[PDB]
């Protein structure tokens, strides 16, 4: 930890990191460069309550635990020189650094087949995106969502509740193909179909003409607006140009270190080790952005602190479904607690691998999720009969 600290990016990972530095005792200079001209804000409401109600002052991140920080908003870091220890800014200024932190997140992947489209096509990542989408979301408008990940499905539910007709195209045979158990994915499709979502599986967009989208099966979908959500790409251009190891994501170890001395990275921009799979992955969850940011800051101030160690998890709010998912999507068996029914959905899945818990899912059952995450964390091997037994209390069993 060499002063001054410069952080590139002012999203959740960045805010979490600078607040932990200050709370841990670092009182030297901290400067944050953020390219959006927005008071730092949280993204999950953009698909839900913001999209519906429209109040951005309900979604701002609390920067109060980060006193004495200069936030350069609406400014783009254009390059950094890791030998000179400087960053070049879009406003013509240069910042010196002792420690540089790359927290630049990721940007929506574009659909090449819609690149010359003459109809409204948006992605959903920023306040500006959400505001733009809202203003075309009239009741009985027709929305096409490309991509069956959580963002798209969250938007789908919000749109339907608002009286918008929703069609959704998914290339893979299942929704949430990333980091969701098949049982959950099948149920999620059943729910959305029941809410009026027109789901098209194993189809791809081949292009568009005069307000209609074309598909690989040779068919058409007319819509007033397309929202594309087919995943994101790490914002790692600065690192690539400066000579750091990247591959759609900056490689970091558990201390947030990149291959370049005095340069760290955290959050959506990173590829990091998933302790459960033992493989490097770009983890794009809210909890990772916050918790990896805190862990890296904590170790920078106190090098005896351990590195980042959390196992990955996320939630997704999709209408009546409060979904929570932790660990791996699959193992050698799945234990199902409760019934999988559209009639007041409430159930828990547990994935096991040689008797050890390696994954869990709760749907409208937040009470069981916390003890499942603790069990997950220690690689517990409970009695599978007790794990199926609805009489069992997971909170009790967790100690």
Contact between 235 and ligand FAD (CB under 6 A)?
A: yes
Q: Classify strands 347-353 and 333-337 as parallel, antiparallel or unpaired.
A: antiparallel
Which listed residue (1, 4, 36, 353) binds ligand FAD by CB under 6 A? Answer: 36
Q: Classify strands 94-96 and 333-337 as parallel, antiparallel or unpaired.
A: unpaired
Asked if 22 and 113 count as a contact pair (C-beta separation under 8 A), the reply is no
Q: At closest approach, how far in Å is the CB of 82 from ligand FAD?
A: 15
Q: Classify strands 225-228 and 142-146 as parallel, antiparallel or unpaired.
A: parallel
Contact between 332 and a second copy (CB under 8 A)?
A: no
Provide the phi-psi class of 262: left if phi over 0, else alpha when psi is between -120 and 50, else beta. Answer: left
Closest to a second copy by CB, 113 vs 195, is 113
Report the number of secondary-structure helices (H) and strands (E) in the chain: 10, 26
Q: DSSP assignment of 5-47, as one string?
A: EEEE--SHHHHHHHHHHHHHT--S-EEEEESS-S--B-SGGGG
- Given a second copy, ligand FAD, none, residue 307, with its beta carbon under 5 to 8 Å by kind, binds a second copy
Which listed residue (25, 112, 261, 390) binds a second copy by CB under 8 A? Answer: 261
| Contacts (Cβ under 8 Å, ≥6 apart) of 116 | none
Q: At closest approach, how far in Å is the CB of 125 from ligand FAD?
A: 5
- CA dist., res. 99 & res. 103, Å (int): 13
Query: What is the pattern of x (binds ligand FAD, CB under 6 A) and - over residues 275-294?
Result: ---------xxx--x-----
- Given a second copy, ligand FAD, none, residue 92, with its beta carbon under 5 to 8 Å by kind, binds none
Which listed residue (18, 19, 30, 43) binds ligand FAD by CB under 6 A? Answer: 43
Contact between 105 and ligand FAD (CB under 6 A)?
A: yes
Residues 284-323 interacting with a second copy (rule: CB under 8 A): 307
- Given ligand FAD, a second copy, none, residue 280, with its beta carbon under 5 to 8 Å by kind, binds a second copy
Q: At closest approach, how far in Å is the CB of 335 from ligand FAD?
A: 24
Which listed residue (91, 253, 339, 383) binds a second copy by CB under 8 A? Answer: 253
Residue 220's SS3 state is strand
Which listed residue (132, 165, 273, 374) binds a second copy by CB under 8 A? Answer: 273
Residues 124-153 interacting with ligand FAD (rule: CB under 6 A): 124-125, 150-151
Q: Which two tokens stand for residue 24?
A: 């841990």
Edge-to-edge strand list for the sheet holding 198-201:
121-123, 225-228, 142-146, 165-170, 198-201
Q: At closest approach, how far in Å is the CB of 245 from a second copy?
A: 4
**Quick one: how far is CA 73 from the chain centroid?**
22
Contact between 255 and a second copy (CB under 8 A)?
A: yes
| Contacts (Cβ under 8 Å, ≥6 apart) of 124 | 46, 47, 108, 130, 133, 151, 155, 227, 229
Q: Which two tokens stand for residue 92?
A: 């013509």
**Which range binds a second copy by CB under 8 A, 150-158, 239-247, 290-298, 331-339?**
239-247
Residues forming a β-bridge with 205: 215
Q: At closest approach, how far in Å is the CB of 194 from a second copy?
A: 41
**Quick one: how far is CA 202 from the chain centroid?**
24
**Which range binds a second copy by CB under 8 A, 119-127, 130-138, 251-259, 324-332?**
251-259
Q: Which residues of this chain interact with ligand FAD, rule CB under 6 A?
A: 8-14, 33-36, 43-44, 46-47, 76-77, 103-106, 124-125, 150-151, 154, 235, 238, 267-269, 284-286, 289, 314-316
């Amino acid at each position: 930890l060499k002063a001054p600290v410069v952080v590139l990016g002012a999203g959740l990972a960045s805010v979490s990191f600078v607040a932990e530095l200050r709370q841990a005792g670092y009182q030297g200079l901290i400067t944050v460069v953020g390219d959006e001209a927005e008071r730092p804000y949280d993204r999950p409401p953009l698909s839900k309550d913001f999209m519906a109600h429209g109040d951005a002052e309900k979604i701002r991140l609390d920067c109060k635990r980060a006193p004495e920080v200069e936030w350069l908003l609406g400014v783009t870091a254009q390059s950094f020189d890791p030998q000179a220890h400087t960053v070049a800014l879009s406003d013509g200024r240069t910042l010196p650094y002792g420690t540089l932190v790359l927290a630049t997140g990721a940007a929506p992947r574009a659909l090449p087949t819609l690149q010359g489209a003459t109809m409204p096509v948006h992605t959903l990542r920023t306040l500006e995106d959400a505001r733009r989408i809202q203003a075309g979301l009239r009741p009985q408008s027709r929305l096409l969502i490309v991509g069956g990940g959580v963002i798209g499905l969250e938007l789908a539910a919000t749109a339907r509740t608002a009286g918008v007709h929703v069609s959704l195209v998914q290339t893979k045979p299942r929704l949430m193909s990333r980091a969701a158990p098949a049982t959950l994915a099948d149920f999620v499709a059943r729910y959305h179909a029941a809410q009026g979502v027109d789901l098209r599986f194993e189809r791809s967009v081949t292009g568009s003409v005069d307000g209609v989208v074309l598909l690989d099966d040779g068919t058409r979908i007319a819509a007033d607006m397309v929202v594309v959500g087919i995943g994101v790409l790490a914002n790692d251009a600065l690192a690539r140009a400066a000579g750091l190891a990247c591959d759609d994501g900056i490689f970091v170890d558990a201390y947030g270190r990149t291959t370049c001395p005095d340069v760290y990275a955290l959050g959506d921009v990173t590829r990091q080790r998933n302790p459960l799979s033992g493989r490097f992955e770009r983890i794009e969850t809210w909890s990772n952005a916050q918790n990896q940011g805190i862990a890296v800051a904590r170790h920078l101030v106190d090098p005896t602190a351990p590195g980042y160690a959390e196992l990955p998890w996320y939630w997704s709010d999709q209408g009546a479904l409060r979904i929570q998912v932790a660990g791996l999507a699959s193992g050698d068996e799945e234990i199902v607690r409760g019934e999988v029914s559209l009639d007041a959905p409430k159930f828990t899945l547990i994935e096991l691998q040689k008797g050890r818990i390696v994954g869990a899912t709760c749907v409208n059952n937040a009470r069981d999720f916390a003890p499942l995450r603790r069990l997950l964390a220690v690689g517990a091997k409970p009695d599978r009969a007790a794990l199926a037994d609805p009489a069992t209390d997971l909170r009790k069993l967790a100690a």
